[PDB]
Amino acid sequence: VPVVRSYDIFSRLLKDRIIFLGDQVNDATAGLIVAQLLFLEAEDPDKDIHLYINSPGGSITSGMAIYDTMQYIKPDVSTICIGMAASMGAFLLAAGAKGKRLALPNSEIMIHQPLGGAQGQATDIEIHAKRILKIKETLNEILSERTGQPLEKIKMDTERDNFMSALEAKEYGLIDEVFTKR
């Protein structure tokens, strides 16, 4: 990792209120994101946050920790998609402050329904099946309110993997802008 009185390259950009989610969503990365989000709020509760997203998704609970923290903190959290934002990556992309959700022209967006599993007694399988169904309905209702789409349309569009271009994600309502240059 490159260094820059001697920061590292990712902490030097943290001074410019830039955070990177360029990895899978899990308890380790989401812990760093939350810690960076909380810290940047304590530094300045009104200056915007710039969260670059290049993530294929991951753990739903880890992602909801990022989501709720983004809404919990005072600063607007602008989200920029580079490369790919899929599943919980795309969800956190659509969760940025409305009007400041960007994506570069060749970035890949993908939304789908939750993934999970359950093995054991039939009773425990039902308990976990109902849990992931509530999570699916919760995420759909949040996606609908953040894109403007009707709830039933989000349902049909997330049953299977749904790949979109940056322009298609803008018209759909997942992002607000598609910039090639500044």
Ligand code: NA
């Ligand atoms: Na916020």
